[PDB]
Design an enzyme around this catalytic site. Structure first.
Site, PDB file in Angstrom:
ATOM      1  N   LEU A  74      -2.471  11.249  12.045  1.00 26.80           N
ATOM      2  CA  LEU A  74      -2.281   9.901  12.558  1.00 26.80           C
ATOM      3  C   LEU A  74      -1.846   9.879  14.015  1.00 26.80           C
ATOM      4  O   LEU A  74      -1.883   8.809  14.633  1.00 26.80           O
ATOM      5  CB  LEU A  74      -1.238   9.144  11.728  1.00 26.80           C
ATOM      6  CG  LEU A  74      -1.555   9.049  10.232  1.00 26.80           C
ATOM      7  CD1 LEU A  74      -0.521   8.183   9.541  1.00 26.80           C
ATOM      8  CD2 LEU A  74      -2.941   8.484  10.031  1.00 26.80           C
TER       9      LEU A  74
ATOM     10  N   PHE B  41       4.216   1.396   8.710  1.00 24.90           N
ATOM     11  CA  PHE B  41       4.384   2.309   7.595  1.00 24.90           C
ATOM     12  C   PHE B  41       5.506   3.288   7.888  1.00 24.90           C
ATOM     13  O   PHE B  41       5.900   3.512   9.039  1.00 24.90           O
ATOM     14  CB  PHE B  41       3.078   3.040   7.248  1.00 24.90           C
ATOM     15  CG  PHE B  41       2.494   3.832   8.375  1.00 24.90           C
ATOM     16  CD1 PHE B  41       1.676   3.223   9.315  1.00 24.90           C
ATOM     17  CD2 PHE B  41       2.720   5.197   8.466  1.00 24.90           C
ATOM     18  CE1 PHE B  41       1.120   3.953  10.355  1.00 24.90           C
ATOM     19  CE2 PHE B  41       2.168   5.942   9.514  1.00 24.90           C
ATOM     20  CZ  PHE B  41       1.353   5.317  10.444  1.00 24.90           C
TER      21      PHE B  41
ATOM     22  N   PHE C 141       2.019  10.728   1.394  1.00 25.99           N
ATOM     23  CA  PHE C 141       1.370  10.206   2.587  1.00 25.99           C
ATOM     24  C   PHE C 141       2.320   9.245   3.293  1.00 25.99           C
ATOM     25  O   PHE C 141       2.999   9.631   4.250  1.00 25.99           O
ATOM     26  CB  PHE C 141       0.061   9.513   2.223  1.00 25.99           C
ATOM     27  CG  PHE C 141      -0.739   9.056   3.416  1.00 25.99           C
ATOM     28  CD1 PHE C 141      -0.516   9.599   4.677  1.00 25.99           C
ATOM     29  CD2 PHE C 141      -1.697   8.067   3.280  1.00 25.99           C
ATOM     30  CE1 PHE C 141      -1.249   9.169   5.775  1.00 25.99           C
ATOM     31  CE2 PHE C 141      -2.432   7.632   4.374  1.00 25.99           C
ATOM     32  CZ  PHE C 141      -2.212   8.190   5.619  1.00 25.99           C
TER      33      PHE C 141
ATOM     34  N   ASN D 265      -2.451  -0.527  11.988  1.00 25.87           N
ATOM     35  CA  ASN D 265      -3.265  -1.364  12.847  1.00 25.87           C
ATOM     36  C   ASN D 265      -4.641  -1.488  12.223  1.00 25.87           C
ATOM     37  O   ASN D 265      -4.911  -0.951  11.143  1.00 25.87           O
ATOM     38  CB  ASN D 265      -3.313  -0.804  14.279  1.00 25.87           C
ATOM     39  CG  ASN D 265      -3.803   0.624  14.332  1.00 25.87           C
ATOM     40  OD1 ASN D 265      -4.890   0.932  13.846  1.00 25.87           O
ATOM     41  ND2 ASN D 265      -3.017   1.503  14.949  1.00 25.87           N
TER      42      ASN D 265
ATOM     43  N   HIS E 282      -1.686   5.689  15.983  1.00 22.31           N
ATOM     44  CA  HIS E 282      -0.672   4.765  15.508  1.00 22.31           C
ATOM     45  C   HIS E 282       0.578   4.974  16.335  1.00 22.31           C
ATOM     46  O   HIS E 282       1.043   6.107  16.501  1.00 22.31           O
ATOM     47  CB  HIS E 282      -0.392   4.975  14.012  1.00 22.31           C
ATOM     48  CG  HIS E 282      -1.598   4.752  13.162  1.00 22.31           C
ATOM     49  ND1 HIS E 282      -1.905   3.524  12.617  1.00 22.31           N
ATOM     50  CD2 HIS E 282      -2.599   5.589  12.796  1.00 22.31           C
ATOM     51  CE1 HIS E 282      -3.034   3.620  11.935  1.00 22.31           C
ATOM     52  NE2 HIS E 282      -3.479   4.859  12.035  1.00 22.31           N
TER      53      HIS E 282
ATOM     54  N   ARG F 154       0.865  -1.178   0.000  1.00 21.04           N
ATOM     55  CA  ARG F 154       0.000   0.000   0.000  1.00 21.04           C
ATOM     56  C   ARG F 154       0.900   1.226   0.000  1.00 21.04           C
ATOM     57  O   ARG F 154       1.580   1.503   0.991  1.00 21.04           O
ATOM     58  CB  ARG F 154      -0.943   0.001   1.203  1.00 21.04           C
ATOM     59  CG  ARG F 154      -2.031   1.078   1.162  1.00 21.04           C
ATOM     60  CD  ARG F 154      -2.613   1.274   2.557  1.00 21.04           C
ATOM     61  NE  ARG F 154      -3.542   2.397   2.629  1.00 21.04           N
ATOM     62  CZ  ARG F 154      -3.778   3.097   3.732  1.00 21.04           C
ATOM     63  NH1 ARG F 154      -3.171   2.817   4.871  1.00 21.04           N
ATOM     64  NH2 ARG F 154      -4.643   4.109   3.686  1.00 21.04           N
TER      65      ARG F 154
ATOM     66  N   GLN G  32       3.378   1.492   3.128  1.00 21.55           N
ATOM     67  CA  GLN G  32       2.980   0.520   4.137  1.00 21.55           C
ATOM     68  C   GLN G  32       3.356  -0.889   3.704  1.00 21.55           C
ATOM     69  O   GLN G  32       3.163  -1.271   2.544  1.00 21.55           O
ATOM     70  CB  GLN G  32       1.474   0.600   4.403  1.00 21.55           C
ATOM     71  CG  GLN G  32       0.937  -0.443   5.371  1.00 21.55           C
ATOM     72  CD  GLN G  32      -0.517  -0.189   5.738  1.00 21.55           C
ATOM     73  OE1 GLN G  32      -1.007   0.929   5.609  1.00 21.55           O
ATOM     74  NE2 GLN G  32      -1.212  -1.225   6.193  1.00 21.55           N
TER      75      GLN G  32
END
Length: 183
Positions: free
Chosen positions: A126, A117, A64, A106, A130, A59, A67
């Site tokens: 975030l 990530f 951004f 998660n 996280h 991903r 991941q």
């Protein structure tokens, strides 16, 4: 206060398709999130008989994060910790200060497994959801090469972005690094 102490170092060696891209070296904040750090370190060495070696970044979203860490299914539904399937959020002492910070993916509160990530921007939204546990020490150009790889809809790279090799490096002494973005 403005520094965090790196206590362990790990490396990811990256290929995209058949091309050898290079190494991401990661410092881990073992005095701040020891349980989270130990999970990530052991999965990097493979010393429990499973881990990140051979897994992919599944991903990838420009501006951004990237991941990875799903070494059991390879699609974001899998992965596991060294403790059992999932463990609690240790703390949220560390924030996503900028590009180049390592944080647990998660599936909600207290569901840390193996997916992680690396931020490529300051992902303030975030923070507090996280657990941040590491920072890129070298190879941010490799991170950005992953970040810019062409993706299918749904953000899976068209070419395989593989952690071909990974492990732990010897660290002579813990050292402080700033709570700021990796240039």
């Amino acid at each position: 206060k403005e520094m965090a102490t790196v206590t362990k170092k790990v490396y990811f060696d990256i290929a995209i398709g058949d091309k050898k891209i290079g190494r991401i070296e990661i410092g881990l904040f073992g005095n701040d999130v020891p349980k989270t750090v130990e999970n990530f370190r052991a999965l990097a060495t493979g010393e429990k008989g499973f881990g990140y070696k051979g897994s992919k970044f599944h991903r990838v979203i420009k501006d951004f994060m990237i991941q990875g860490g799903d070494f059991t299914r390879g699609d974001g539904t899998g992965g596991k910790s060294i403790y059992g399937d999932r463990f609690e959020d240790e703390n949220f002492k560390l924030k996503h200060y900028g590009a180049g910070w390592l944080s647990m993916a998660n599936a909600g509160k207290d569901t840390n497994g193996s997916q992680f990530f690396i931020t490529t921007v300051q992902t303030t939204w975030l923070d507090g959801r996280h657990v941040v546990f590491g920072k890129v020490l070298s190879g941010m150009d490799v991170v950005r090469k992953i970040e810019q790889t062409s993706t299918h809809p749904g953000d899976r790279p068209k070419q395989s972005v593989e952690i071909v090799d990974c492990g732990e490096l010897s660290l002579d002494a813990p050292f402080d690094t700033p709570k700021e973005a990796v240039a």
